[PDB]
Amino acid sequence: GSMSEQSICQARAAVMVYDDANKKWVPAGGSTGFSRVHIYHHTGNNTFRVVGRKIQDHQVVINCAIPKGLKYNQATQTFHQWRDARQVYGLNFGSKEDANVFASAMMHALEVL
Numbered sequence: 001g002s003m004s005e006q007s008i009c010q011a012r013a014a015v016m017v018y019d020d021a022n023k024k025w026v027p028a029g030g031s032t033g034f035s036r037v038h039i040y041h042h043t044g045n046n047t048f049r050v051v052g053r054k055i056q057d058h059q060v061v062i063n064c065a066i067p068k069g070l071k072y073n074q075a076t077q078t079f080h081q082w083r084d085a086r087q088v089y090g091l092n093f094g095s096k097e098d099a100n101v102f103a104s105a106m107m108h109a110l111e112v113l
């Protein structure tokens, strides 16, 4: 059930997607602002996903599988990004610590997939 899926990291970040047509970053879910972003581990099938919800109103702005082999790119010390088939995601972290802790947890997840 639900309890077999566990959060293994959370951080504060503004979630963005790249508008491939207009060549600009846009807020995930339509409104710019900070979200609480988790990496969840489904222990039964050993899969991971990233889920983020806006802090002010809990809107779900990202719910993204993390497949085996995903390339997680640290573009700057506070902006990280990865590819999904439908769009590129970016996380603008609220602090360097948020970014580094999230990235480490992501790299650990990628190495156990």
Ligand SMILES: CC(=O)N[C@@H](Cc1ccccc1Cl)C(=O)N1CCC[C@]12C=C[C@@H]1CC[C@@H](C(=O)N3CC[C@@H]4C=C[C@H]5[C@H](C)C[C@@H](C(=O)O)N5C(=O)[C@H]43)N1C2=O
Binding pocket: 002, 003, 004, 005, 006, 007, 040, 051, 060, 063
């Ligand atoms: C913040 C947090 O995780 N608290 C958990 C804390 C906790 C407590 C006990 C053990 C484990 C955990 Cl981790 C929580 O208190 N509980 C209460 C029981 C349930 C849960 C426990 C585990 C799962 C993990 C995953 C998350 C969940 O349910 N999530 C994430 C947001 C995501 C968003 C929307 C909905 C969508 C409508 C449908 C579906 C969709 O995304 O398809 N879905 C979701 O999947 C929604 N769980 C929980 O919330």
Ligand SMILES: CC(=O)N[C@@H](Cc1ccccc1Cl)C(=O)N1CCC[C@]12C=C[C@@H]1CC[C@@H](C(=O)N3CC[C@@H]4C=C[C@H]5[C@H](C)C[C@@H](C(=O)O)N5C(=O)[C@H]43)N1C2=O
Binding pocket: 028, 029, 030, 060, 061, 062, 063, 064, 084, 086, 087
């Ligand atoms: C597999 C996959 O990645 N699929 C993507 C979506 C996708 C499918 C096919 C091709 C490309 C893409 Cl990109 C996905 O699921 N993504 C992309 C990031 C966001 C989301 C992740 C989670 C949440 C859960 C809720 C839902 C959501 O956000 N929906 C539903 C549609 C509905 C329409 C409009 C907007 C309105 C502007 C504001 C608000 C309003 O109605 O108030 N709203 C919404 O509520 C909007 N999510 C998503 O779409």
Ligand SMILES: CC(=O)N[C@@H](Cc1ccccc1Cl)C(=O)N1CCC[C@]12C=C[C@@H]1CC[C@@H](C(=O)N3CC[C@@H]4C=C[C@H]5[C@H](C)C[C@@H](C(=O)O)N5C(=O)[C@H]43)N1C2=O
Binding pocket: 018, 025, 071, 072, 073, 075, 076, 079, 081, 082, 083, 088, 092
């Ligand atoms: C091979 C591959 O897939 N490559 C991807 C990246 C990637 C590599 C490996 C694995 C996965 C991925 Cl995903 C790629 O290159 N992609 C995917 C997204 C589009 C982009 C393509 C072109 C542009 C060029 C510029 C850069 C960009 O977007 N950058 C630069 C840093 C800079 C920092 C912050 C944000 C700021 C919050 C808003 C805005 C601002 O500064 O105004 N901004 C930015 O401008 C941000 N691009 C990209 O990243």
